C-alpha cells in the first residue's frame, strides 16, 4: 500500500536532467552520490533503519547504475552516454579490453529497452524492485523489504495494462530483464575489482568504498 508510480517517476526525473575505463569509473563515482538522493525519494525507503538502507544500496548500486545509463543510451548508436556527458563508443570499449561486457550491455540491456520503448516510469519501478532486494544478507527485517518490493511491482503491473493494454506481456517482459541485469551487474564488479587490484585506473572515494568488504 502507498507505492504510487507518480512518486517513483519523480525520483527518476529529479536525479537526472581518454581511457574509456577511467571515464566509466569517474562516472560511477559521480552517480553514487546521486543514487543516494534517488533512493531517499523512493517511498518508505528512508523509513527503513539506517543499517538496512546501507545494505540495500551496497547490494544494488551496480545494477541500479547499470540500468540507468543503459536506458539513457537508448537513442545512442553503438555506445552509452555517461552521466559526465561523455559518450563511450563500442569500438572504444573494445580497444580497452572491456569489449565482451560492453557488448552484453548493448545487446541484453540497451537494445532491449529500446525495442520495447521502456519509459521512465517503467525504469523507475524496475530499479525500485532492485533496490528493495529481500535477499540482501544482514537485513534486520527482510520480510518488510519483501513487502515493499511486492508493492512496487503491483503498482508497476497496474501502470502497464492500463498504459499499454494492447501489450499483456509487457509486465513480464520488464521483470524478465532483471536476470540479465543481475548477470551483467556481477561481471562489471569483477572488472572493477581487477582494476583496483592492478592499480591502474584511478578510483574515487565513494566508488572505492563500494568495493570494500563485504
Amino acid at each position: 500500500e502507498d507505492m504510487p508510480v507518480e512518486r517513483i517517476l519523480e525520483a527518476e526525473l529529479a536525479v537526472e536532467p581518454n581511457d574509456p575505463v577511467t571515464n566509466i569509473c569517474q562516472a560511477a563515482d559521480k552517480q553514487l552520490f546521486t543514487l543516494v538522493e534517488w533512493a531517499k525519494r523512493i517511498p518508505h525507503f528512508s523509513e527503513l533503519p539506517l543499517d538496512d538502507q546501507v545494505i540495500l544500496l551496497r547490494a544494488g548500486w551496480n545494477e541500479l547504475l547499470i540500468a540507468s545509463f543503459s536506458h539513457r543510451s537508448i537513442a545512442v548508436k553503438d555506445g552509452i552516454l555517461l552521466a559526465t556527458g561523455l559518450h563511450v563508443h563500442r569500438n572504444s570499449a573494445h580497444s580497452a579490453g572491456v569489449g565482451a561486457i560492453f557488448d552484453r550491455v548493448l545487446t541484453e540491456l540497451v537494445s532491449k529497452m529500446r525495442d520495447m520503448q521502456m519509459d521512465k516510469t517503467e525504469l523507475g519501478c524496475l530499479r525500485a524492485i532492485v533496490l528493495f532486494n529481500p535477499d540482501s544478507k544482514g537485513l534486520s527485517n527482510p520480510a518488510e523489504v519483501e513487502a515493499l518490493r511486492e508493492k512496487v511491482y503491483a503498482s508497476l503491473e497496474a501502470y502497464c495494462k492500463h498504459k499499454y493494454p494492447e501489450q499483456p506481456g509487457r509486465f513480464a517482459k520488464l521483470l524478465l530483464r532483471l536476470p540479465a541485469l543481475r548477470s551483467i551487474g556481477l561481471k562489471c564488479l569483477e572488472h572493477l575489482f581487477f582494476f583496483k587490484l592492478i592499480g591502474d585506473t584511478p578510483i574515487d572515494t565513494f566508488l572505492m568504498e563500494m568495493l570494500e568488504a563485504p
Binding site: 552520490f33 543516494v36 539506517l50 546501507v54 565513494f206 568504498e209 568488504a213
Partner: peptide, 11 residues
C-alpha cells in the same frame, strides 16, 4: 566502515 554512505543517508 562505510563512512561516506552513512553520512549521505543521514543528511
Amino acid at each position: 566502515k562505510h563512512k561516506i554512505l552513512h553520512r549521505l543517508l543521514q543528511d
